[PDB]
Coordinates of all heavy atoms in Angstrom, one line a residue:
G1 N -4.9 -2.4 24.3 CA -5.4 -1.0 24.0 C -4.6 -0.4 22.9 O -4.2 0.8 23.1
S2 N -4.1 -1.2 22.0 CA -3.2 -0.7 21.1 C -3.1 -1.8 20.0 O -3.3 -1.4 18.8 CB -1.8 -0.6 21.8 OG -1.7 -1.7 22.6
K3 N -3.1 -3.0 20.4 CA -3.2 -4.2 19.7 C -4.2 -4.1 18.6 O -4.0 -4.4 17.4 CB -3.6 -5.4 20.6 CG -3.2 -6.8 20.1 CD -1.9 -7.2 20.8 CE -1.5 -8.6 20.4 NZ -0.4 -9.0 21.3
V4 N -5.4 -3.6 19.1 CA -6.6 -3.4 18.3 C -6.5 -2.1 17.6 O -7.0 -2.0 16.5 CB -7.8 -3.5 19.2 CG1 -9.1 -3.2 18.5 CG2 -7.8 -4.9 19.9
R5 N -5.9 -1.0 18.3 CA -5.7 0.2 17.6 C -4.9 0.1 16.3 O -5.1 0.9 15.4 CB -5.0 1.3 18.4 CG -5.1 2.8 17.8 CD -6.0 3.7 18.7 NE -6.3 5.0 18.1 CZ -7.3 5.8 18.6 NH1 -8.0 5.4 19.7 NH2 -7.5 7.0 18.1
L6 N -4.2 -1.0 16.1 CA -3.5 -1.3 14.9 C -4.4 -2.1 14.1 O -4.5 -1.8 12.9 CB -2.1 -1.9 15.0 CG -1.5 -2.0 13.6 CD1 -1.3 -0.6 12.9 CD2 -0.1 -2.6 13.7
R7 N -5.0 -3.1 14.6 CA -6.0 -4.0 13.9 C -7.1 -3.2 13.1 O -7.7 -3.7 12.2 CB -6.7 -5.0 14.7 CG -5.7 -6.1 15.2 CD -6.2 -6.9 16.4 NE -5.1 -7.8 16.9 CZ -5.2 -8.5 18.0 NH1 -6.3 -8.3 18.9 NH2 -4.3 -9.4 18.4
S8 N -7.3 -1.9 13.5 CA -8.2 -1.0 12.8 C -7.6 -0.7 11.5 O -8.2 -0.7 10.4 CB -8.3 0.3 13.6 OG -8.8 1.4 12.8
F9 N -6.3 -0.4 11.5 CA -5.4 0.1 10.5 C -4.5 -1.0 10.1 O -3.3 -0.9 9.9 CB -4.6 1.2 11.1 CG -5.5 2.4 11.3 CD1 -5.8 2.7 12.6 CD2 -6.1 3.1 10.2 CE1 -6.8 3.7 12.9 CE2 -7.0 4.1 10.5 CZ -7.3 4.4 11.8
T10 N -5.1 -2.2 9.9 CA -4.6 -3.5 9.5 C -5.8 -4.2 9.0 O -5.8 -5.2 8.3 CB -3.9 -4.2 10.6 OG1 -2.6 -3.6 10.8 CG2 -3.6 -5.7 10.3
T11 N -7.0 -3.5 9.3 CA -8.3 -3.8 8.7 C -8.7 -2.5 8.1 O -9.8 -2.0 8.3 CB -9.3 -4.4 9.6 OG1 -8.8 -5.5 10.3 CG2 -10.5 -4.9 8.8
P12 N -7.8 -2.1 7.2 CA -8.2 -2.1 5.8 C -7.8 -3.4 5.4 O -6.6 -3.7 5.6 CB -7.4 -1.0 5.1 CG -7.1 0.0 6.2 CD -7.2 -0.8 7.5
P13 N -8.7 -4.4 5.0 CA -8.5 -5.8 4.8 C -7.1 -6.2 4.7 O -6.5 -6.8 5.7 CB -9.3 -6.1 3.5 CG -10.5 -5.2 3.7 CD -10.0 -4.0 4.5
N14 N -6.4 -5.8 3.6 CA -5.0 -5.8 3.5 C -4.9 -5.0 2.3 O -4.1 -5.3 1.4 CB -4.3 -7.2 3.3 CG -2.8 -7.0 3.5 OD1 -2.0 -7.0 2.5 ND2 -2.4 -6.8 4.8
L15 N -5.7 -3.8 2.2 CA -5.6 -2.8 1.2 C -4.3 -2.0 1.3 O -4.2 -1.0 0.6 CB -6.8 -1.9 1.4 CG -8.2 -2.6 1.2 CD1 -9.4 -1.7 1.5 CD2 -8.3 -3.2 -0.2
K16 N -3.3 -2.6 2.0 CA -1.9 -2.4 1.9 C -1.5 -2.8 0.5 O -0.5 -2.4 0.0 CB -1.1 -3.2 2.9 CG -1.5 -2.9 4.4 CD -0.7 -3.7 5.4 CE -1.3 -3.5 6.8 NZ -0.6 -4.2 7.9
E17 N -2.3 -3.7 -0.1 CA -2.0 -4.3 -1.4 C -2.2 -3.3 -2.5 O -1.4 -3.2 -3.4 CB -2.8 -5.6 -1.7 CG -4.1 -5.5 -2.5 CD -5.3 -5.0 -1.8 OE1 -5.8 -5.6 -0.8 OE2 -5.8 -3.9 -2.2
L18 N -3.1 -2.3 -2.3 CA -3.3 -1.1 -3.1 C -2.0 -0.4 -3.2 O -1.4 -0.2 -4.3 CB -4.3 -0.1 -2.5 CG -5.7 -0.7 -2.3 CD1 -6.6 0.3 -1.6 CD2 -6.4 -1.1 -3.6
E19 N -1.4 0.0 -2.0 CA -0.1 0.6 -1.8 C 1.0 0.0 -2.7 O 1.7 0.6 -3.4 CB 0.4 0.6 -0.4 CG -0.6 1.0 0.7 CD -0.2 0.7 2.1 OE1 1.0 0.2 2.3 OE2 -1.0 1.0 3.1
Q20 N 1.1 -1.4 -2.6 CA 1.9 -2.3 -3.4 C 1.8 -2.1 -4.9 O 2.8 -2.0 -5.6 CB 1.8 -3.8 -3.1 CG 1.9 -4.2 -1.6 CD 3.1 -3.5 -0.9 OE1 4.2 -3.9 -1.2 NE2 2.8 -2.5 0.0
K21 N 0.6 -2.0 -5.4 CA 0.2 -1.8 -6.8 C 0.9 -0.5 -7.3 O 1.7 -0.6 -8.2 CB -1.3 -1.7 -7.1 CG -2.1 -3.0 -6.8 CD -3.5 -2.9 -7.4 CE -4.4 -4.0 -6.9 NZ -4.8 -3.8 -5.5
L22 N 0.5 0.6 -6.6 CA 1.0 2.0 -6.9 C 2.4 2.1 -7.2 O 2.9 2.8 -8.1 CB 0.6 2.9 -5.8 CG 1.0 4.4 -5.9 CD1 2.4 4.8 -5.4 CD2 0.7 5.0 -7.3
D23 N 3.3 1.2 -6.5 CA 4.7 1.1 -6.7 C 5.0 0.7 -8.1 O 5.5 1.5 -8.9 CB 5.4 0.2 -5.8 CG 5.2 0.7 -4.3 OD1 5.5 1.9 -4.1 OD2 4.7 -0.1 -3.5
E24 N 4.6 -0.6 -8.6 CA 4.8 -1.1 -9.9 C 4.6 -0.2 -11.0 O 5.3 -0.2 -12.0 CB 3.8 -2.3 -10.1 CG 3.8 -3.3 -9.0 CD 2.7 -4.3 -9.4 OE1 1.5 -3.9 -9.5 OE2 3.0 -5.5 -9.7
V25 N 3.6 0.7 -10.8 CA 3.2 1.8 -11.7 C 4.3 2.8 -11.8 O 5.0 2.8 -12.8 CB 1.9 2.4 -11.4 CG1 1.4 2.9 -12.8 CG2 0.9 1.4 -10.8
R26 N 4.6 3.6 -10.7 CA 5.6 4.5 -10.6 C 6.9 4.2 -11.3 O 7.2 4.9 -12.3 CB 6.0 4.8 -9.1 CG 5.0 5.7 -8.3 CD 5.5 7.2 -8.2 NE 5.7 7.7 -9.6 CZ 6.9 7.7 -10.3 NH1 8.1 7.5 -9.6 NH2 7.0 7.8 -11.6
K27 N 7.5 3.0 -11.0 CA 8.6 2.3 -11.6 C 8.4 2.4 -13.1 O 9.2 3.1 -13.8 CB 8.7 0.9 -11.1 CG 9.9 0.1 -11.7 CD 11.2 0.3 -11.0 CE 11.9 1.6 -11.3 NZ 12.1 1.8 -12.8
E28 N 7.4 1.6 -13.6 CA 7.0 1.5 -15.0 C 7.0 2.9 -15.7 O 7.7 3.1 -16.6 CB 5.7 0.8 -15.1 CG 5.5 0.1 -16.5 CD 4.0 -0.2 -16.7 OE1 3.2 -0.1 -15.7 OE2 3.6 -0.5 -17.9
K29 N 6.2 3.8 -15.1 CA 6.0 5.2 -15.5 C 7.3 5.8 -15.6 O 7.6 6.3 -16.7 CB 5.2 6.0 -14.5 CG 4.8 7.4 -15.0 CD 5.8 8.5 -14.8 CE 5.2 9.8 -14.2 NZ 4.7 9.5 -12.9
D30 N 8.1 5.9 -14.5 CA 9.4 6.6 -14.4 C 10.3 6.1 -15.5 O 10.5 6.9 -16.4 CB 10.0 6.7 -13.0 CG 10.3 5.4 -12.2 OD1 11.2 4.6 -12.6 OD2 9.7 5.3 -11.1
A31 N 10.7 4.8 -15.4 CA 11.5 4.2 -16.4 C 11.0 4.4 -17.9 O 11.8 4.7 -18.8 CB 11.6 2.7 -16.3
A32 N 9.7 4.4 -18.1 CA 9.1 4.8 -19.4 C 9.4 6.2 -19.8 O 9.8 6.4 -20.9 CB 7.6 4.6 -19.4
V33 N 9.3 7.2 -18.9 CA 9.5 8.6 -19.3 C 11.0 8.8 -19.7 O 11.3 9.8 -20.4 CB 9.3 9.7 -18.2 CG1 8.6 10.9 -19.0 CG2 8.5 9.2 -17.1
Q34 N 11.9 8.0 -19.1 CA 13.3 8.0 -19.2 C 13.7 7.6 -20.6 O 14.8 7.9 -21.0 CB 14.0 7.1 -18.2 CG 14.4 7.8 -16.8 CD 13.2 8.1 -15.9 OE1 12.4 9.0 -16.3 NE2 13.1 7.4 -14.8

């Protein structure tokens, strides 16, 4: 009753990968402004 309540929010396919991308940017961006 929880196992699955996470599998909801682990099915965003693995659109955790989105989150991963956004990082690389920030970095790049930040260091670039510097």
